[PDB]
Design a protein around this nucleic acid. Sequence first.
RNA 1: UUUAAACCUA
Length: 177
Amino acid sequence: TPPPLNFSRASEHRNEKGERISMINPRVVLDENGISHRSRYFIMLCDNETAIAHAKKTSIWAVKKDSSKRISDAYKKASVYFIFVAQQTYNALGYAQVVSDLNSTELPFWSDSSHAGGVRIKWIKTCNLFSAEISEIVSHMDHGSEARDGMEMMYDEGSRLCTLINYAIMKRIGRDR
RNA sequence: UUUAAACCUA
């Protein structure tokens, strides 16, 4: 059990060269946004149970136009993960790796004109999990304010969310299957 | 009926 994660001085975590490093694994070098060039994480906030259930069944997600370019750019450069969060309750729904690039023609039936295109995903965990620290992370993910759908999060936010999801599921808390 | 990845592994 490592001590609580805090971003008040997260920018102060530096290696000997002066590069920003992760607070969770100091070997991971970050840019000045706290993002790892190798592993990148975006939040998908969603209240549509039809969409979420379709996504967990068919391993497809519709990407918003307002975040599609940054996600498409990240996919060509890094491993890219979506962490799915219920928009009103902040329950974690799971997380998945993006495994194909944006595609304007391959959109799920539930997508609308706010979406740019479809991506295939590979679910890593699925859940329906309430965790107070997950909810706190999502609540502060936009410079201390609530997450915006599709935004990229810092490496330590993504990694801690994956850890928290894995831990609960292993404790048989918050499973969906 | 759910080994996160990566990094590091004497």
